[PDB]
Amino acid sequence: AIAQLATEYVFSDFLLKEPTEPKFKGLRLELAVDKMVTCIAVGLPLLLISLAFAQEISIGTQISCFSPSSFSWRQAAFVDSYCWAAVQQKNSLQSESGNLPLWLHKFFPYILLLFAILLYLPPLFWRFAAAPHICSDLKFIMEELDKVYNRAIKAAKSARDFKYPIVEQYLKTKKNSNNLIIKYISCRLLTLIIILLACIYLGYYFSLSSLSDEFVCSIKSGILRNDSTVPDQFQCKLIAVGIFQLLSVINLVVYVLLAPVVVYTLFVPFRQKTDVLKVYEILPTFDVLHFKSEGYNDLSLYNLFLEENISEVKSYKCLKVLENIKSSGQGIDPMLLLTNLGMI
Amino acid sequence: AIAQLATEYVFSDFLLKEPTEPKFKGLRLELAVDKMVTCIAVGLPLLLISLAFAQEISIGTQISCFSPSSFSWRQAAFVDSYCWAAVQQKNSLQSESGNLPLWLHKFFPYILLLFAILLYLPPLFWRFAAAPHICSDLKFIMEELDKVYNRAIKAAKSARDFKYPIVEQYLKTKKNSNNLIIKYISCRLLTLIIILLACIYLGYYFSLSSLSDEFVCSIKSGILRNDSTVPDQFQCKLIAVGIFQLLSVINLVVYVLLAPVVVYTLFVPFRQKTDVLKVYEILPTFDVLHFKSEGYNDLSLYNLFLEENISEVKSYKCLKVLENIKSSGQGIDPMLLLTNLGMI
Amino acid sequence: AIAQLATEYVFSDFLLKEPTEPKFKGLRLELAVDKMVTCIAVGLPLLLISLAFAQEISIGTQISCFSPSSFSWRQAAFVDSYCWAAVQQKNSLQSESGNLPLWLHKFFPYILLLFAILLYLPPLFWRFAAAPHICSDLKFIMEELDKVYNRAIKAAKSARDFKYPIVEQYLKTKKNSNNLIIKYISCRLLTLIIILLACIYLGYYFSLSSLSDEFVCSIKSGILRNDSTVPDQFQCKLIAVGIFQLLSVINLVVYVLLAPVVVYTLFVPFRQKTDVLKVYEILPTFDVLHFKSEGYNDLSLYNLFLEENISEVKSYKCLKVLENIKSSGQGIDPMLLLTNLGMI
Amino acid sequence: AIAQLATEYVFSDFLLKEPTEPKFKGLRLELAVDKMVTCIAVGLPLLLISLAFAQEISIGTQISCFSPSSFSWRQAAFVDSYCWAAVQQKNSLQSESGNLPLWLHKFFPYILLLFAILLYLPPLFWRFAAAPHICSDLKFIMEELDKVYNRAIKAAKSARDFKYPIVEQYLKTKKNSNNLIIKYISCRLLTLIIILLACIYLGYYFSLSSLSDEFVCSIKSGILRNDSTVPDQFQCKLIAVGIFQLLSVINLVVYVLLAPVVVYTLFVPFRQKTDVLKVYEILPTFDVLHFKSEGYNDLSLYNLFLEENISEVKSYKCLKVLENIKSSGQGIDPMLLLTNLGMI
Numbered sequence A, B, C, D: 001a002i003a004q005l006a007t008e009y010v011f012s013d014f015l016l017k018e019p020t021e022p023k024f025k026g027l028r029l030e031l032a033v034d035k036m037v038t039c040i041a042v043g044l045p046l047l048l049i050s051l052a053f054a055q056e057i058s059i060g061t062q063i064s065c066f067s068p069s070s071f072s073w074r075q076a077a078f079v080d081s082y083c084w085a086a087v088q089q090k091n092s093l094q095s096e097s098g099n100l101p102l103w104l105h106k107f108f109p110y111i112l113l114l115f116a117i118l119l120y121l122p123p124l125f126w127r128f129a130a131a132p133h134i135c136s137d138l139k140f141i142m143e144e145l146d147k148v149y150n151r152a153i154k155a156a157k158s159a160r161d162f163k164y165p166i167v168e169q170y171l172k173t174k175k176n177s178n179n180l181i182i183k184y185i186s187c188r189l190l191t192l193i194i195i196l197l198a199c200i201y202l203g204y205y206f207s208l209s210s211l212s213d214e215f216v217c218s219i220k221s222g223i224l225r226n227d228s229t230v231p232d233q234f235q236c237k238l239i240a241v242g243i244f245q246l247l248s249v250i251n252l253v254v255y256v257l258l259a260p261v262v263v264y265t266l267f268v269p270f271r272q273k274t275d276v277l278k279v280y281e282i283l284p285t286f287d288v289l290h291f292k293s294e295g296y297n298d299l300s301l302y303n304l305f306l307e308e309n310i311s312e313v314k315s316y317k318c319l320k321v322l323e324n325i326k327s328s329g330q331g332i333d334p335m336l337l338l339t340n341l342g343m344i
């Protein structure tokens, strides 16, 4: 039913499931905005397909041709289904709007499903190509940060009672390589292109006269060509075309609202702000150098991924609260770090 | 519904499930490109079968013959079903396009399912013949790499405060044997042949006049041969033939796009690049010799499998980050290895 | 739907489920070739049954008799169902092909299910009679091999820094007893006989004229015997008979391709090759004697089972890699064994 | 569908599920032959019921009466259902075969279900009355055997570097009591009686003329008794009666084949052979006395249960392999026991 479809597609974890594998434990592997965009762009057309043929909104068959009274119910079914299959056969029907409107009315669910699949494709390519590498690198970064925080707190405790910047060097090296950012940008751009094409198609579908669903149908090919009792033509109407138009304009509105989000996601360096690593700069064991900004490189993407999935790190949380308390300046950063005792 | 089929076949883990057994824990056993190719080539025809008979796109019965008005609904059903079963009986029907078009229109779902099964067969043969052996060998290689990394870091720590290349010898021995690569190439070639045959069939199906679905049917065998009230013949149309043609051309496009991927996978030595073992060459306990390239042997396949499923190895990840930092050259490889302290 | 049936019967673990019990943990208990043969021979006829009555390929009812126009729809249903039930009643119908073709057309799903059950019976007898014993014996053999490997490596380590061949004696004793091999051969032979009988039946079914589905039906027994308004006879056609013939020839092709596999499995001693125990002959604690070949005894079957399910043994894997490295001969077997340190 | 029913009833664990409780962990509680007999005798009639009304074999309604053409479809439905309900009302119908054939044709599924329930009853009584006691006793016996084996191996190791026969005394005491064997024999005898009664009924059902399904029906009681437009009687046929007869003869064949198995299971002392305890007689800590044979007592039943579910005992497996090696006589039993080191 309508409610079941809603629960499946909006109120449930449709495409929101975390990776079902121990490799990615607690790692999103996908930005929240991108996940929202993909979920909307994929599960909206599916939801509209399901709604358009719901047991309640749907009167019944998808086409009726109004055969003469003399025709039996089976002859009427023959006429209806013949015209349904003959929307593609151009000679069979003669409609003012043409034959493309009939093609579109018959295959609208297929086109919506195609758009959903094409929008889900780039996310899947990301997941199966660039997600494992970024996940491994981010796990390494998290482990390095936790280890350096533990070493710093241990040193502070020893004072009260190697030292090489491996992670910073790794980030600096990542500053040059840009394959990951290139893949991300290409996926976002393809998603935007697919969304714009879908908007064009939906606008064309919704701009129709709304009478193109009605077409003239002629069962007059073969032995029935010269038959007399059969009328020369029939009046057929494609049902649910208005519902398709309504759902198409709804999807068009959603996609036009979503496209600005897509271009914003494409403009990654502007998103690269609120330095996550600035918090760690107070640790004696961590070098005071962020050096991550203003670059169309994988470093900005890694910074965004950290800002997205760093709240799960206890050391980062402790450093963040220490910096927050430093806003007043009443205490001292090393004293607060020693007092916290948050190694694990 | 359409959306349920889409969720099952594209947005879910259809054929993407990892082995349900402790023997293969975290091991793909299949290259990402090959898994994509198999998933597409198998779940596309199934998806098209499901779509073609969806409750919405489908008007109703698969054939209607337009019996005279005098005929009852049961007589009409008899005529329709008789012609449905008589598409195979050549004498019963007389169609301009012949009888093969009618056979194909009636059995298109069967042919798509046959193609899906034939494309899934080589992957299954791989899984049940060559996957256990490669999995065991790769687990041995991973264990050897982890052990040698642990020994190297322990030796470095001891210095700061056997030695036989077993894995390299095993790889060198694998360089000669080629049964695994032969099986892989044979499976890929059979998949390519099946895909090309499917493309030929789909092109033939889509090249039909689109009027071959209409055939003349004669219920005039037996006691009804000389009956007068029954007309000498009927006008029958095979419904969903246009939808079958649309889906067949879609599958043809997908398969022609996919075949280049298949030939690329077949050309394995060119894929054999970005030496995974080059990272380990800096370890004192590991001999500095890759010796894996330019060969139609199982060694290249093992190299590809390593490059595919080596990101899960912490020692390999540490070595990779060490080499990445070595790009700048600021530090020293042994110093970085000692500082990392990433035994486990 | 067709796709759901395919996913259930070919793309899922249909009859491929490992034993759901702790007694057999990681043990196949069945050769890969035999499992493939059983899975095909069982799930093919079931798949064909499901396909033949699929919602898409199936026009509707399984028989239509074309009652006169004057007959009501309920009278038509009576005639159709009466003839359906009277295919068995010989006097009721008069068909040129006889009555056995009608019996077969009506009961084809039952016959396919019977063949599937009869082919699944010998595997089930194997599982519930001979599988526990072989599983226990093979677990004992694996434990003995692991223990002797551990003792050998411990002795080598002690040198660097009982001894009775219990497993070999057990294998030698098994050389005489042949109940297990006799049961295996009997099951394979019964499977082959059932397959050949199924091939004969399917060939007979597919060799029919294809017009035997049409039979003349007479509702003229009882009070209707002398009734005038009812015609003396009707023209009935058994629907899906052509689909049954197509599926039967497909199953015939599959079974004729499979029977050579069955005879190959029956010829077990020829399969008994690539001595699995030859690898263990280099261990000082293991006697250098294979003594397992050229015998219609349970020893060959045990050798096959070992070759099938020995890859899970770490000691066997280590010995295999040691022998593989010995192909070059650069190193020494005891030195490699000491260096491996693969006790557990 | 047919295939789904087959998978549920033959290819799945129908009545083969082990007890879902920690009390019986790895204990069958039921002999393999008895479990097979019960599973067949219960799930065969259910399978036949399901098959007889399958969506494919079933034409439609279970009865059709061929009301005159003037009758509406609702009047025809009234006549059909009235006759369906009036098969029991003797005055309403007049059939040559009588009224018992019609009763049986209408209630065949009920009778098959009754036979299945009556055959499942004795197994359930066994499970809920005698299974816990035998399970506890057998667990005690297994624990005693494991303890004595451990003590014997410990004594042998001590020599190289109480003693009361509690289990044998318990078995000797069990030799007298016979309530368990009496219950087992009574259950088997009741199963045999039910099977024979089912065979008699199925033979009577299959021996019918096959025209007894056709009966004359009279809707002439009440206000319709003197009505003129309604014919004095109708020609009704009970559909699926031939299918019921086919399935009944199949079940008869299965049951007649099964009854010899039942009488063999009833003759338990002859089954009591291949002394399981003879293997333990070589242990110094175990008295050399089997004393279990030739008795209609619970001791033979316990011996059978041990022979059925003793393969899971590591001590028994070790003793069995020791005795097997003793066939050659090359070594010594105590030496082999010491070398095995299989305490746990």
Ligand SMILES: CC(C)CCC[C@@H](C)[C@H]1CC[C@H]2[C@@H]3CC=C4C[C@@H](O)CC[C@]4(C)[C@H]3CC[C@]12C
Pocket (backbone or CB within 6 Å): A197, A198, A200, A201, A204
């Ligand atoms: C998803 C993408 C490919 C959709 C592209 C736009 C589609 C939906 C529509 C929008 C406007 C349409 C065009 C409008 C006008 C004409 C002129 C006519 O004589 C032939 C068809 C043609 C040329 C149409 C083809 C299809 C069209 C391009």
Ligand SMILES: CC(C)CCC[C@@H](C)[C@H]1CC[C@H]2[C@@H]3CC=C4C[C@@H](O)CC[C@]4(C)[C@H]3CC[C@]12C
Pocket (backbone or CB within 6 Å): A196, A199, A200, A203, A204, A207, A256
């Ligand atoms: C992403 C944004 C830009 C989408 C907004 C929808 C736009 C593109 C839609 C809305 C109305 C549409 C037009 C409606 C009518 C016609 C006439 C037809 O003969 C050619 C196409 C044409 C000219 C359409 C082109 C696309 C169109 C302009």
Ligand SMILES: CC(C)CCC[C@@H](C)[C@H]1CC[C@H]2[C@@H]3CC=C4C[C@@H](O)CC[C@]4(C)[C@H]3CC[C@]12C
Pocket (backbone or CB within 6 Å): B197, B198, B200, B201, B204
């Ligand atoms: C999956 C594989 C086997 C499909 C092979 C191609 C099939 C689909 C088609 C493509 C072209 C077809 C052929 C085209 C023309 C003819 C000539 C005619 O007088 C007999 C049939 C015959 C000989 C056809 C047989 C079937 C055919 C070969």
Ligand SMILES: CC(C)CCC[C@@H](C)[C@H]1CC[C@H]2[C@@H]3CC=C4C[C@@H](O)CC[C@]4(C)[C@H]3CC[C@]12C
Pocket (backbone or CB within 6 Å): B196, B199, B200, B203, B204, B207, B256
């Ligand atoms: C994998 C690639 C090559 C597939 C491309 C589809 C090709 C093979 C298709 C497209 C159109 C097809 C042709 C269409 C019409 C006919 C006429 C018929 O009487 C014989 C087959 C023949 C000549 C077909 C052969 C196959 C064909 C050429």
Ligand SMILES: CC(C)CCC[C@@H](C)[C@H]1CC[C@H]2[C@@H]3CC=C4C[C@@H](O)CC[C@]4(C)[C@H]3CC[C@]12C
Pocket (backbone or CB within 6 Å): C197, C198, C200, C201, C204
């Ligand atoms: C599964 C096994 C039992 C099937 C055995 C073969 C079956 C399918 C068929 C193949 C050929 C058939 C026979 C062919 C010819 C005749 C002669 C006829 O006057 C009586 C039936 C009889 C004797 C048939 C009986 C059934 C038969 C034996």
Ligand SMILES: CC(C)CCC[C@@H](C)[C@H]1CC[C@H]2[C@@H]3CC=C4C[C@@H](O)CC[C@]4(C)[C@H]3CC[C@]12C
Pocket (backbone or CB within 6 Å): C196, C199, C200, C203, C204, C207, C256
């Ligand atoms: C496993 C292999 C051998 C199976 C091959 C199928 C064979 C056995 C099939 C194919 C055609 C069949 C024949 C077709 C027609 C008839 C005529 C009939 O009156 C008697 C049976 C007989 C003579 C059949 C016997 C079985 C048959 C020869």
Ligand SMILES: CC(C)CCC[C@@H](C)[C@H]1CC[C@H]2[C@@H]3CC=C4C[C@@H](O)CC[C@]4(C)[C@H]3CC[C@]12C
Pocket (backbone or CB within 6 Å): D197, D198, D200, D201, D204
């Ligand atoms: C399950 C058990 C109870 C079934 C017992 C057998 C049943 C199926 C059948 C087999 C033979 C049958 C009997 C055959 C003949 C007659 C004579 C008739 O004038 C009255 C019914 C009576 C007496 C039948 C009663 C039912 C009967 C006993």
Ligand SMILES: CC(C)CCC[C@@H](C)[C@H]1CC[C@H]2[C@@H]3CC=C4C[C@@H](O)CC[C@]4(C)[C@H]3CC[C@]12C
Pocket (backbone or CB within 6 Å): D196, D199, D200, D203, D204, D207, D256
């Ligand atoms: C377990 C074994 C013995 C079952 C074998 C089935 C036997 C018992 C069946 C097969 C044919 C049957 C007979 C068929 C016909 C009749 C005539 C009827 O008026 C009385 C019952 C009677 C005489 C049946 C009694 C039971 C019967 C003999």
Ligand SMILES: *[C@@H]1O[C@H](CO)[C@@H](O)[C@H](O)[C@H]1NC(C)=O
Pocket (backbone or CB within 6 Å): A222, A223, A225, A226
């Ligand atoms: C129908 O009748 C017309 C009359 O002109 C004729 O041309 C045509 O061939 C006929 N069609 C058939 C199928 O006979």
Ligand SMILES: *[C@@H]1O[C@H](CO)[C@@H](O)[C@H](O)[C@H]1NC(C)=O
Pocket (backbone or CB within 6 Å): B222, B223, B225, B226
């Ligand atoms: C039908 O009538 C024709 C008239 O020529 C005759 O040849 C044929 O045998 C008849 N068919 C039947 C089944 O009697």
Ligand SMILES: *[C@@H]1O[C@H](CO)[C@@H](O)[C@H](O)[C@H]1NC(C)=O
Pocket (backbone or CB within 6 Å): C222, C223, C225, C226
């Ligand atoms: C039908 O009428 C015929 C006329 O010969 C007669 O023999 C037969 O008995 C009648 N049938 C019935 C059921 O009265």
Ligand SMILES: *[C@@H]1O[C@H](CO)[C@@H](O)[C@H](O)[C@H]1NC(C)=O
Pocket (backbone or CB within 6 Å): D222, D223, D225, D226
């Ligand atoms: C039907 O009519 C008959 C005529 O004899 C009469 O006996 C009977 O009572 C009537 N039935 C009813 C229900 O009035």
